[PDB]
């Protein structure tokens, strides 16, 4: 596993979201493990 | 039980600077994702920048980062923001909150940029 996705994943669970079927990272994936591009990702639902 | 009291906005050039003061009770501030969001003139809100009073993360949107900054005083339960280098859409209320989509926020503090 990526160091680097866990500890932007564990970030981001800590915050509230979950990672059901892995959609939490999946996103960080697509944002080059950026909480700020994952954040504004999430906030345009 | 949980209340939120912005202050430090005003009417600024473009490129001036101004530091957002955000005063929090009610709850464990001192380890807490805490947020600033802001309401564009005829916008919805939007998160502006978290972080983590415990360890001290922190987190901008990508439209001010690398211009504001964001830090706490444990100690006195405020919660700040340091703008730098204004724009024009910058002009917002800007709010604390402790969500993202600002749903439990304070009555917020105006910031206008204007020349």
């Known amino acids: 596993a990526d160091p680097r996705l866990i500890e932007s994943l564990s970030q981001m669970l800590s915050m509230g979201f979950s990672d059901e079927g892995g959609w939490l990272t999946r996103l960080l994936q697509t944002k080059n493990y950026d909480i700020g591009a994952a954040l504004d990702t999430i906030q345009y639902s | 039980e949980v209340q939120l009291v912005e202050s430090g906005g005003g009417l600024v050039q473009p490129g001036g600077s101004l530091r957002l003061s955000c005063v929090a009770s009610?709850?464990?501030?001192?380890?807490?994702?805490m947020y600033w969001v802001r309401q564009a003139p005829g916008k919805g809100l939007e998160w502006v920048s978290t972080?983590?009073?415990?360890?001290?993360?922190?987190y901008y949107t990508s439209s001010v980062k690398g211009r504001f900054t964001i830090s706490r005083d444990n100690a006195k339960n405020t919660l700040y923001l340091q703008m730098n280098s204004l724009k024009s859409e910058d002009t917002a209320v800007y709010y604390c909150?402790?969500?993202?989509?600002?749903?439990?926020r304070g009555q917020g503090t105006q910031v206008t940029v204007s020349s």
């Open positions: 972080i983590n009073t415990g360890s001290g993360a922190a």
């Open positions: 909150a402790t969500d993202l989509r600002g749903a439990q």
């Open positions: 009610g709850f464990t501030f001192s380890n807490y994702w």
